[PDB]
């Protein structure tokens, strides 16, 4: 199931929701919260759901008339003249799905620091080598980061050592250390508490 | 005329492969054959179709020729030739050909079935209503075939040492029909068959065949 992306939505009204359907090798390639892309057909698909009035129906065209004692009327007429509801929902029969917003433009795929280089394009790893080697990198992510926020310096340095995280462990007992931060920010009305949390959603 | 006499020896002389097969497999080659005949003389003729849209071809001259004393279970289902004196005939009663059905539980007319020599066609389902409930004859749609059964018993003058006369039940159809009369000597070729609905499976006695010649060709024996 997916569902309409927040900037197509029209004033005053929710999402709409269509159910798309993957086959043989596009079957796994759409996880929950994923924003992608879907290829493929809008279809129909018989759905079984009435009682809002009857409505359109099949039926044979071949003129037949049950005989005394077992009149096409009621349920043994209905059945007899093949009588079914042609009732339809939309549904979205996908040949291929790809990310809305590819990260690396070379080509998706067990993501090891090598996979994920590899993954990349030359330029695209250019940059990521120059910043690695960027002297003042932490400085220039803060500033990147919020770009709009003055000062709060200590704030923007934490979230976004949040955003790089520790490491997890497993103790031998079965033990498991948390490997990533947690910030919290306790502010006074308007400090931009709203703001940091925004900037890192978006 | 609808109906077609080719020669055996002709046939022979010309491709034996098919006259080899055409004794041991008769009805088949025979429906080949019909099929081939309509094909060639709608042909020649382009508006013989609404004429009679079936060509029946009788095989003449065959050399299979097998008195009524002889024939065993090892002729069946083959064409062999007799020859002998018909004793009886029916008339010519109307057989079912493409029988049209009536389901009376909602009056629909079930496709025209054709009707073997072996079986009675019953319908399955009503394809609109779907009952298996009774059915009937759609009299007006359906089309019939000319019926005949003579009975033949061999000329009296071939039977000699001292015995009887033997006789075989024959179906004439549609063309063979009144081609024979009781008196009449006659040469007769035809599929000596078993599989219908004779078999005295009543306990009656035992499980013994009843046998019928399917006429192919008819030829009297006299002037005209
Ligand atoms: N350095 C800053 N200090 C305080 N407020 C700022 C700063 N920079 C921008 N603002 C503005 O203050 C406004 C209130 O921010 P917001 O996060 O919505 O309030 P709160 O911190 O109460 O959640 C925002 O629109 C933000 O743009
Ligand atoms: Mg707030
Ligand atoms: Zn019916």
Redesign the pocket.
């Known amino acids: 199931r997916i569902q309409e992306t927040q900037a197509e939505l029209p004033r005053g009204s929710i999402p709409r929701s269509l159910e798309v359907i993957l086959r043989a090798e596009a079957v796994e390639s759409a996880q929950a919260g994923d924003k992608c892309d879907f290829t493929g057909t809008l279809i129909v698909v018989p759905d079984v759901s009435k009682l809002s009035t009857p409505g359109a129906r099949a039926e044979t065209n071949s003129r037949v008339s049950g005989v005394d004692g077992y009149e096409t009327e009621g349920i043994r007429g209905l059945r007899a003249l093949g009588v079914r509801d042609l009732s339809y929902r939309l549904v979205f029969l996908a040949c291929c799905v790809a990310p809305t917003n590819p990260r690396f433009g070379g080509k998706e795929l067990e993501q090891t620091a090598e996979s994920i280089k590899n993954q990349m394009t030359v330029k695209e790893w250019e940059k990521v080598f120059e910043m690695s080697q960027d002297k003042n990198l932490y400085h220039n992510l803060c500033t990147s980061l919020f770009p709009?926020?003055?000062?709060?310096d200590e704030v923007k340095r934490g979230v976004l050592l949040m955003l790089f995280g520790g490491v997890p462990k497993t103790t031998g007992e079965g033990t498991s250390l948390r490997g990533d931060i947690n910030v919290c920010?306790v502010?006074?009305?308007?400090?931009?508490?709203?703001?940091?949390?925004?900037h890192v959603e978006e | 005329r609808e109906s077609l006499v080719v020669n055996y020896e002709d046939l022979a002389a010309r491709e034996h492969v098919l006259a080899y097969f055409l004794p041991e497999a008769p009805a088949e080659l025979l429906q080949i054959f019909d099929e081939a005949a309509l094909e060639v003389v709608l042909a020649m003729y382009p508006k013989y179709d609404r004429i009679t849209n079936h060509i029946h071809v009788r095989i003449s001259h065959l050399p299979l020729v097998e008195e009524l004393r002889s024939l065993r279970q090892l002729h069946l289902n083959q064409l062999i030739r007799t020859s002998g004196v018909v004793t009886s005939c029916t008339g010519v009663l109307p057989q079912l050909s493409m029988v049209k059905y009536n389901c009376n539980k909602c009056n629909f007319v079930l496709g025209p079935f054709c009707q073997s020599q072996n079986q009675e066609v019953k319908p399955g389902s009503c394809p609109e209503c779907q009952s298996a409930g009774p059915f009937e004859v759609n009299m007006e749609e359906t089309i019939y075939q000319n019926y005949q059964r003579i009975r033949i018993q061999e000329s009296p003058g071939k039977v000699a040492a001292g015995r009887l006369p033997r006789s075989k039940d024959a179906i004439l159809l549609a063309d063979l029909v009144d081609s024979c009369k009781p008196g009449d000597e006659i040469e007769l070729t035809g599929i000596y068959h078993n599989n219908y609905d004779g078999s005295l499976n009543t306990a009656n006695g035992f499980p013994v065949f009843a046998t019928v010649i399917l006429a192919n060709h008819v030829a009297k024996k006299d002037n005209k």
């Open positions: 709009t926020i003055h000062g709060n920010i502010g006074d009305p308007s400090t931009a508490k709203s703001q940091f949390l925004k």
